[PDB]
């Protein structure tokens, strides 16, 4: 800490999130933020992103938590290093609030 | 740390805050930000929000600190887990400053 | 940590900052951000602000560091509690950069 | 921690970043953020910036990581004190994402 | 044209807008913008605003058009002069769009 | 002029725009803004939007001008009234510029 | 129309505006925007600005309208050409609204 | 009016602007906005931009007015159609103001 940190800021993707008739019939915007630690050539982050986009847009999700976890797993699938954190914002998910997000991390 | 963190970003509510004639006669805008830890189906955050909105709009407050605490308590009332942090911004409360906020946390 | 934290966000003040002919002849904008810890009625933050504004606008400064320190001291002058942090932004102080800031803290 | 922290916020520079025909033929925007610790007259940060700008604009880079490191080194070249952190954002480097950044730090 | 123009920018009010179960059970945010012409002491705009706020918050609306018209009328009720324009934004009323607004004007 | 104006602000849609290998293989973000005049119940703008979204997402475009025109036509297809203007932004289409847009209008 | 138009965007000045005890004891922020037409060497706009700043900061105002007019006059005092428009925003002058402004123009 | 309008929004370029020692030794940021009318395949706007960028970055300017005119001329050099408007912002050119711009148009 700190050392080698790569950040993917505000990756905006559209997919199905929710179970409600409208949520299942229409795609919505969700915002992904990725923090990857890998101390200390590198075609990496591009592939990780590619995979996360592909997985997110080509699927249906019932719960931000499942989506976040799936992404997190995708992030540790290829490298073994070192620490990964994923926050997923569902913009305007609550009345009167700008967003609601779920963050998950791993070693 | 980090693990399971849910964030409720910029929940904008209107209520009475202050003792001043104008503050008691007219509602004002206040901005709430909630950080909840709950390692590691979940109809939870929706209910918590519902309760915090309902409590905030349906009452009168004399001091940001009382409001923040009341919210914090509301956040730990239902689950026992795990860590909760509440920041409340009173926008343009001071001359020349964008905001003033009070943050409180608990185990 | 975390517990009782009060934040004063983007207090914009105008004063003389610098030694350069233009800096001494003309006031400039500077942005102050204050973090105060005081675990766990309170006419406090209003007075602190009052004093910091009054001190900043009614003086001349040769160096962000002196200004920041003076504010920090003003913050610990009245209460003994508990932790205080002061960041001062000199907007557009460097070519091509949004700002330059100095942060100082105390126990 | 915290103590003496100087921040250089959003230093926007244009240079060549990448190997792709377009990346080598045309300069791009990159955003640098510098955090310097130096507890506890000072013509310093101005010179550091000067050197980082000069080095960045007067060169070609094949990889954000090389650019970030080069800057970091430039930051510790003159003083011995104390801690330095450099984040470099390549705006709109990924499709659908606001930015991608690399952060590096040192003692 | 141009001459005497007063603008009330982004008046944010909460009221009931819509017929849908959720729209009738819960208040929503709406943003009002007023342009008043009165060529060429004046306690006016304050009263107009007062009346528009009071009318908007103390009622229920079935359609942006009715709300906008009601405001417009309120604007010409007191003075006879000279030209008035009212835009009402229903933020995030459409999927994927920042807002939808209705503008109405009068002589 | 002015009278009855409805505005659809920043309708963000993703579709294929361009002929370039990357433009044809990957969808991009485009921002639509609609101005409709209809002097002086109304399930209208919702349907218009529905149709414009459906047409935009379910097709491929070779040129902003074709896309803009197609939308404009969709806007006059249902009502006969009265004036319609459509601006389409292709964000970050040019190096160093925030956007490029095409606007078209009709009677 | 259009031809030679110079714009001075968001000139932020602090002065006394109002009659209320607080308004007379404390300076406030006001935002000035100037549009000057002069079809078709020029040390002009710098001097105009200089004079408007000097006049605004070195005086007390009872009413946005007086302030706006005084500025407008200052703008036509030196050149005879050609058209001038002045908007003055009093930020957060009304509850729930971002600003209130007064615009005045001349030949 | 309105009909075929293409807009190039916030083209940010760096060049030498001014006569002052610092202005001649160091490049600065300037923001260009182009409005082109051409009622009613088109490799046009790309070339126009290319030429305006190339001309702006590969030269030195003594006065926003000369720069704006040079761009305007570049815009009418290739097509004969139809109306062109060019605004050039010199960000933070005046103390306390966000920008100063010069606009010029032609038939």
Author numbering:
A (entry chain A), B (entry chain A), C (entry chain A), D (entry chain A), E (entry chain A), F (entry chain A), ...: 6 to 45, 56 to 122
From the article:
FolX encodes an epimerase that forms one step of the tetrahydrofolate biosynthetic pathway, which is of interest as it is an established target for important drugs.
The structure is not complete, as only residues 6–46 and 55–122 can be observed in the electron density. This disordered region exhibits the greatest sequence disparity compared with E. coli FolX although it is located opposite to the active site and is therefore unlikely to affect overall function. Most of these residues are disordered and not present in the electron density, implying that the active site of P. aeruginosa FolX is flexible in the absence of substrate, or exhibits multiple conformations. The interfaces between the subunits are made up by strands β4 on one subunit and β1 on the next in the circle. Analysis of the interface between the tetrameric rings, using PDBePISA, indicates that there are 16 hydrogen bonds and 8 salt bridges connecting the two tetramers, which may suggest that this interaction is significant despite the relatively small interface area. The infinite dilution sedimentation coefficient (s20,w0) of FolX, derived from the concentration dependence of s20,w, determined by fitting the data with a non-interacting discrete species model, is 6.09 ± 0.03 S. This corresponds with the value of s20,w0 computed (using SOMO) for the octamer crystal structure (5.97 S) and not with that computed for the tetramer (3.62 S). The octamer crystal structure fits well into the envelope confirming that this is the true solution oligomeric state.
